[PDB]
């Protein structure tokens, strides 16, 4: 019976405007919008940049996500950044894997 209005994965939100029938008598049925949000509490400010500050503030204006300052890594998407590496004095760029679990070659 749930109608999942929004499932934005950056600003994790699961607004479900599920209708609930009231008791045995209809015509007073209640409508409820369950904004289930999972604040990460640990993700960095610029989530793709690990060296950025920590998120001490989480704005969830529901108007924007109904229709970006990304917070939570999406399952399918891979967030990564280049890293410097030194082995014998050579500084070689290479891509990283900030979410290795979902970033296997597929």
């Amino acid at each position: 019976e749930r109608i999942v209005l929004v499932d934005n994965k950056c600003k994790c939100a699961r607004i479900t405007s599920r209708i609930i029938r009231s008791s045995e008598d209809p015509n007073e049925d209640i409508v409820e919008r369950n904004i289930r949000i999972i604040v990460p509490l640990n993700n960095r400010e610029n989530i793709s940049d690990p060296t950025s500050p920590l998120r001490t503030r989480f704005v969830y204006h529901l108007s924007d996500l109904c229709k970006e300052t990304c917070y939570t890594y999406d399952r399918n998407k891979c967030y990564t950044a280049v890293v410097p590496l030194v082995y014998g004095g050579e500084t070689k760029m290479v891509e990283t894997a900030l979410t290795p679990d979902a970033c296997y070659p597929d």
């Binding site: 209005l5 607004i15 405007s17 919008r33 904004i35 949000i37 604040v39 509490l41 640990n42 960095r44 690990p50 060296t51 500050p53 920590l54 001490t56 503030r57 989480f58 704005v59 969830y60 204006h61 529901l62 108007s63 109904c66 229709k67 990564t80 890293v83 410097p84 590496l85 030194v86 082995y87 014998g88 050579e90 070689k92 290479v94 891509e95 990283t96 894997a97 900030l98 290795p100 970033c103 296997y104 070659p105």
Partner: protein, 231 residues
């Protein structure tokens, strides 16, 4: 007069995009009689010693072998033997090195731990340990960074892989970096990288600062606006 064949470290395989074999002999008199040929499993020898570097502070002889071989050829399991004909050695010896057969591939889960609260209370130094757990093959490569600036190789010291007690196939590695507690108290981010085969693109990184390593306080300012937001 000891010569040892060094198996190809994955650091050279990946970052330099080449395979180099070094069967170096040290603590021997200089006669320049070394004839080093990296004979393969087949009769053909891929390459001989190149760029011999005798110059050292101790003035002892030092001949280093080289073998530029294909990475796929390495993965095929072909073995290579280094032979030394120096008169110091009583007889020539061949050092066969082979790529291990049937090694399982498992992701190197990288966990970065912050210095203990008590250690910071010491107000003298703080040690950050990057733990690499559950990886196969045993070979692994770890480096350290701070806000995009790699640290000196001496500042961070890593441990040789040892078997994982619960998973005999897997291994674990241990790398520790030390910094002044003021640097840690500043909140400077420290990032640890692990270069290993099992990873998707062979490199993964994790970072930690004062505010995320078992922090005492969670300062949240959660704000929601336009709760209704019908659409």
């Amino acid at each position: 007069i000891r010569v040892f064949a060094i198996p190809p470290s994955f650091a050279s395989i990946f970052l330099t995009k080449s395979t180099k074999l070094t069967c170096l002999v040290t603590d021997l008199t200089t006669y320049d009689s070394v004839t080093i040929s990296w004979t393969r499993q087949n009769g053909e020898a891929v390459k001989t010693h190149t760029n011999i570097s005798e110059s050292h502070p101790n003035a002892t002889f030092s001949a280093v072998g080289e073998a530029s071989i294909c990475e796929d050829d390495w993965n095929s399991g072909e073995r290579f033997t280094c032979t030394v004909t120096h008169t110091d050695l009583p007889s020539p010896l061949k050092q066969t090195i082979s790529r291990p057969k049937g090694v399982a591939l498992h992701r190197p889960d990288v966990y970065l731990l912050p210095p203990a609260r008590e250690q910071l209370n010491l107000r003298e130094s703080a040690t950050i340990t990057c733990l690499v757990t559950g990886f196969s093959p045993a070979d692994v490569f770890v480096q350290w960074m701070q806000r995009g600036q790699p640290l000196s190789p001496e500042k961070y010291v890593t441990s040789a892989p040892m078997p994982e007690p619960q998973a005999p196939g897997r291994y674990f590695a241990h790398s520790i970096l030390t910094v002044s507690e003021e640097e840690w108290n500043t909140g400077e981010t420290y990032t640890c990288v692990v270069a290993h085969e099992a990873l998707p693109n062979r490199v993964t990184e994790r970072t930690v600062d004062k505010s995320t390593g078992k922090p005492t306080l969670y300062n949240v300012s959660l704000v929601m606006s336009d709760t209704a937001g019908t659409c």
